[PDB]
Enzyme design. Structure first.
Site, PDB file in Angstrom:
ATOM      1  CG  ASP A   1       2.086  -6.362   1.130  1.00 31.71           C
ATOM      2  OD1 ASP A   1       1.416  -6.465   0.058  1.00 31.71           O
ATOM      3  OD2 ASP A   1       2.855  -5.414   1.281  1.00 31.71           O
TER       4      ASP A   1
ATOM      5  CG  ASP B   1     -13.099  -0.505   8.663  1.00 29.71           C
ATOM      6  OD1 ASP B   1     -13.982  -1.041   9.381  1.00 29.71           O
ATOM      7  OD2 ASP B   1     -13.221  -0.115   7.473  1.00 29.71           O
TER       8      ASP B   1
ATOM      9  CG  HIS C   1       2.466  -1.068  -0.602  1.00 27.13           C
ATOM     10  ND1 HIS C   1       3.238   0.120  -0.581  1.00 27.13           N
ATOM     11  CD2 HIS C   1       1.842  -1.163  -1.815  1.00 27.13           C
ATOM     12  CE1 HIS C   1       3.127   0.759  -1.761  1.00 27.13           C
ATOM     13  NE2 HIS C   1       2.272   0.026  -2.471  1.00 27.13           N
TER      14      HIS C   1
ATOM     15  CG  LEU D   1     -13.548  -5.284  10.625  1.00 26.64           C
ATOM     16  CD1 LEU D   1     -13.357  -4.796  12.045  1.00 26.64           C
ATOM     17  CD2 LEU D   1     -13.801  -6.784  10.602  1.00 26.64           C
TER      18      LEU D   1
ATOM     19  CG  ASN E   1     -17.097  -1.269  10.768  1.00 31.40           C
ATOM     20  OD1 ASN E   1     -17.029  -0.515   9.760  1.00 31.40           O
ATOM     21  ND2 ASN E   1     -15.984  -1.601  11.433  1.00 31.40           N
TER      22      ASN E   1
ATOM     23  CB  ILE F   1     -15.709   3.303  10.927  1.00 28.60           C
ATOM     24  CG1 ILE F   1     -15.156   1.881  11.146  1.00 28.60           C
ATOM     25  CG2 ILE F   1     -16.482   3.880  12.133  1.00 28.60           C
ATOM     26  CD1 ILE F   1     -13.891   1.800  12.075  1.00 28.60           C
TER      27      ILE F   1
ATOM     28  CB  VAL G   1     -12.951   1.070   3.171  1.00 32.09           C
ATOM     29  CG1 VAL G   1     -12.516   2.485   2.766  1.00 32.09           C
ATOM     30  CG2 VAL G   1     -11.719   0.444   3.843  1.00 32.09           C
TER      31      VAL G   1
ATOM     32  CG  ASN H   1       2.762  -2.472 -10.417  1.00 27.38           C
ATOM     33  OD1 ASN H   1       1.631  -2.942 -10.637  1.00 27.38           O
ATOM     34  ND2 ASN H   1       3.160  -2.163  -9.200  1.00 27.38           N
TER      35      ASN H   1
ATOM     36  CE1 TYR I   1       8.583 -20.096 -11.925  1.00 31.98           C
ATOM     37  CE2 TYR I   1       8.138 -18.839  -9.856  1.00 31.98           C
ATOM     38  CZ  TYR I   1       9.017 -19.329 -10.825  1.00 31.98           C
ATOM     39  OH  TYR I   1      10.352 -19.026 -10.748  1.00 31.98           O
TER      40      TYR I   1
ATOM     41  CB  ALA J   1       1.282 -18.137  -9.012  1.00 32.35           C
TER      42      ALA J   1
ATOM     43  CB  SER K   1       0.383  -4.998  -5.139  1.00 31.20           C
ATOM     44  OG  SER K   1       0.895  -3.792  -4.876  1.00 31.20           O
TER      45      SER K   1
HETATM   46 CA   LIG Z   1     -15.717  -0.591   7.686  1.00 32.22          CA
HETATM   47 CA   LIG Z   2      -0.383 -18.232 -13.693  1.00 31.82          CA
END
Ligand SMILES: [Ca+2]
Ligand SMILES: [Ca+2]
Length: 269
Positions: free
Chosen positions: A32, A40, A62, A73, A75, A77, A79, A153, A165, A168, A215
């Site tokens: 990416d 985090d 992104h 993570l 923990n 804090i 997410v 998108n 493909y 993928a 994504s």
């Molecule tokens: Ca976290």
């Molecule tokens: Ca495929």
């Protein structure tokens, strides 16, 4: 306080967490815009294939956001990722503008196969095929990498490349109502769907942001694949892929959703 974004609960990651499946020892490459250092996230390493942008830090936002859905993570804090103990590698193949070439993407795929990644998450789709891209997807696959790619998108009834493909795994996006997000490409080759709307995750500047797109759906699947691998260390990329499709929640139309909604807890039991 740590919050669990709706998509994380929607895929039932917390139930797999409770059973001890966190992504431990699974190597996941995020292809990416880079991944920025964040309280985090735990970034294990990476490479940049973008000329002029030698750092793996994220200059767009992104790649950091995608990374958080996979492995923020567990923990007190921020997410929580689908696979909070996964080993995250930053593979910068997109520049700060959010775009990249078929050759930087291809080099990022080769990198993943050459360095033993188990899963590679690709966020960008191109409307047109590329023999270079296809070669790279095949090479990573034969080297044991599970390539997870966004369907794109455009809202069209066909899917982007490389998602299209055969080697993928193509991921579309659902909304909070479990319907197909309006922009989500679907059709021939779509393997599965995951949450892709109003997705809160990590962002540069040590903060959090909500984004929409295929994504955002993709990392949910890459994270689910990391729990399956942890549970079944001897399975191949193909076994994992097939097991995710087989344990997915049917939503109805195979045209719109492929095998259905990814279910991390059904896939990892
Ligand atoms: Ca976290
Ligand atoms: Ca495929």
């Amino acid at each position: 306080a740590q919050s669990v974004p709706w998509g994380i609960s929607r895929v039932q990651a917390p139930a797999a967490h409770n059973r001890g499946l966190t992504g431990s020892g699974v190597r996941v490459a995020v292809l990416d815009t880079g991944i920025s250092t964040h309280p985090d996230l735990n970034i294990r390493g990476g490479a940049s294939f973008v000329p002029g942008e030698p750092s793996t830090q994220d200059g767009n936002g992104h790649g950091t956001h995608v990374a958080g859905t996979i492995a923020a993570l567990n923990n007190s804090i921020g997410v929580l990722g689908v696979a909070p103990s996964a080993e995250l590698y930053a593979v910068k193949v997109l520049g700060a503008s959010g775009s990249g070439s078929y050759s930087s993407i291809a080099q990022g795929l080769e990198w993943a196969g050459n360095n033993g990644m188990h899963v590679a998450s690709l966020s960008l789709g191109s409307p047109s095929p590329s023999a270079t891209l296809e070669q790279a997807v095949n090479s990573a696959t034969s080297r044991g990498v599970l390539v997870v790619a966004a369907s794109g998108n455009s809202g069209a009834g066909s899917i982007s490349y490389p998602a299209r493909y055969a080697n993928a795994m193509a991921v579309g996006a659902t909304d909070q109502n479990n319907n197909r997000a309006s922009f989500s490409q679907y059709g021939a080759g779509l393997d599965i769907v995951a949450p892709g709307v109003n997705v809160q995750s990590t962002y540069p500047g040590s903060t959090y942001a909500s984004l929409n797109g295929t994504s955002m759906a993709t990392p949910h699947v890459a994270g689910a694949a990391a729990l399956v691998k942890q549970k079944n260390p001897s399975w191949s990329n193909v076994q994992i892929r097939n097991h995710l499709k087989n344990t997915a929640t049917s939503l109805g139309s195979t045209n719109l959703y492929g095998s259905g909604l990814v279910n991390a807890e059904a896939a990892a039991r």
